[PDB]
Enzyme design. Structure first.
Site, short mmCIF file in Angstrom:
data_model
loop_
_atom_site.label_atom_id
_atom_site.label_comp_id
_atom_site.label_asym_id
_atom_site.label_seq_id
_atom_site.Cartn_x
_atom_site.Cartn_y
_atom_site.Cartn_z
N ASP A 44 1.40 -2.53 -2.06
CA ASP A 44 0.13 -1.53 -2.00
C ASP A 44 0.32 -0.11 -1.94
OD1 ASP A 44 -2.94 -1.81 -1.43
OD2 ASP A 44 -2.13 -0.42 0.07
N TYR A 49 -1.17 8.63 -0.70
CA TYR A 49 0.11 8.57 0.25
C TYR A 49 1.31 9.36 -0.13
CZ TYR A 49 -2.53 4.15 1.41
OH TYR A 49 -3.49 3.32 1.72
N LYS A 78 -5.10 3.10 -5.84
CA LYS A 78 -6.17 3.48 -5.33
C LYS A 78 -6.53 4.91 -5.85
CE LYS A 78 -5.13 1.08 -1.08
NZ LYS A 78 -3.87 1.59 -0.78
N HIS A 111 -10.91 3.98 -3.28
CA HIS A 111 -10.17 4.02 -2.12
C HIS A 111 -10.94 4.21 -0.98
CE1 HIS A 111 -5.93 5.57 -0.12
NE2 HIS A 111 -6.80 4.83 0.81
#
Ligand SMILES: NC(=O)c1ccc[n+]([C@@H]2O[C@H](COP(=O)([O-])OP(=O)(O)OC[C@H]3O[C@@H](n4cnc5c(N)ncnc54)[C@H](OP(=O)(O)O)[C@@H]3O)[C@@H](O)[C@H]2O)c1
Ligand SMILES: O=C(O)COc1cc(F)ccc1C(=O)NCc1cccc([N+](=O)[O-])c1
EC number: 1.1.1.21
Length: 316
Positions: A44, A49, A78, A111
């Protein structure tokens, strides 16, 4: 228990994946390499990030080594909130693909339902700290996601942090071409999500549980906060089964027909977190774990609480 769940696009998704939020860029390559070596087949990811390049190095090296084949991996990313515009979605997806060094994603999620003003900043703010919204609505963003399927960039599309009215809005979209395959939401014994899970499952949408361990490394953690991994009631269930508390917390969503994505950069824990297919929580254990719900939500921002699409004013 079977390792994969069938999605409404006809593909199978591994029910256990590795989370990567907060995995430092200098550690996440080795974390993903270890994960693949010890059996993980689902990672994931997200552009926000800031570590997809390093995740990608690991994926590419394990593909090159022929430890795994691409068809055996299930890679999720996402679309960040500053890319909800029609003209930005493809480029955002392609940046993720290029960083992950892939030619398709298995699953691409919106997201959050909240769109923000495009630009370099992931959280554009006004002078009083409110996020600056975009005026592009979840339905037009969804149409842009559908295009990605039709261009071969992604095998499946889905949503994340959508409340049940927002899921329903997508399902009722005029001219809907592809239903969302997944809704990825926070879920653990302190936020058990029965209502939203039942709704999604009743529509054939698979739910992925994020922060299944309660995200003890979340940057906004306080000392006053509840701690799943330290809850003596959960430790007791783990001891009865001769498993760790984390293993119980991972097996719990699996037995609810959820996908679960615990994060670790610690090699021993990455291995521990995967050794969850060989024991079973009883119905009584499951109901007992559900009883710990306190609607304790860890992932939700004050800066977003006036956005028109903020998801957590609704009960579910
Ligand atoms: N869609 C969304 O909006 C959204 C939001 C939140 C999360 N997510 C996804 O869900 C993933 C998981 O959630 P999360 O990262 O918030 O938290 P989490 O998986 O609930 O918890 C991660 C924390 O638990 C520790 N840990 C892992 N295994 C452990 C074990 N066996 N024993 C003890 N501690 C253990 C990790 O430490 P070490 O790493 O130091 O081992 C880390 O501090 C994320 O990484 C991300 O991929 C998505
Ligand atoms: O959103 C996630 O996946 C995990 O949390 C984050 C990860 C990041 F790299 C950066 C920020 C977050 C974060 O604050 N995520 C929380 C968040 C985001 C967007 C909208 C809302 N909202 O309440 O409407 C909340």
């Amino acid at each position: 228990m079977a390792s994969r769940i069938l999605l409404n696009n006809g593909a199978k998704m591994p029910i256990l994946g590795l989370g990567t939020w907060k995995s430092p860029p200098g550690q996440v390559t080795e974390a993903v390499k270890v994960a693949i070596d010890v059996g993980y087949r689902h990672i994931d990811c997200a552009h926000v990030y800031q570590n997809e390049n390093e995740v990608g190095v690991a994926i590419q090296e394990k593909l090159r080594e022929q430890v795994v084949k691409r068809e055996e991996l299930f890679i999720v990313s996402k679309l960040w909130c500053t890319y909800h515009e029609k003209g930005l979605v493809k480029g955002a997806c392609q940046k993720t693909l290029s960083d992950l060094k892939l030619d398709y994603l298995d699953l691409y999620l919106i997201h959050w339902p909240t769109g923000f003003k495009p630009g370099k900043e992931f959280f554009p703010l006004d002078e009083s700290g409110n996020v600056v919204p975009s005026d592009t609505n979840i339905l037009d963003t969804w149409a842009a996601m559908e295009e990605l399927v039709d261009e071969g960039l992604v095998k499946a599309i889905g949503i994340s942090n959508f409340n049940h009215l927002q899921v329903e809005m997508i399902l009722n979209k005029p001219g809907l071409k592809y239903k969302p395959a997944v809704n990825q939401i926070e879920c653990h014994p302190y936020l058990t999500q029965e209502k939203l899970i039942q709704y999604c499952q009743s529509k054939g949408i698979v739910v992925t549980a994020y922060s299944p361990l309660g995200s003890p490394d979340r940057p906004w953690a306080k000392p006053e906060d509840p701690s799943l991994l330290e809850d003596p009631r959960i430790k007791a269930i783990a001891a009865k089964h001769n498993k760790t508390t984390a293993q119980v917390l991972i097996r719990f969503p699996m037995q609810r027909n959820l996908v679960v994505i615990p994060k670790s950069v610690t090699p021993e824990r990455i291995a521990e977190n995967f050794k969850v297919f060989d024991f079973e929580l009883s119905s009584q254990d499951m109901t007992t774990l559900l009883s710990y719900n306190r609607n304790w939500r860890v992932c939700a921002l004050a800066s977003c609480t006036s956005h028109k699409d903020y998801p957590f004013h609704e009960e579910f």
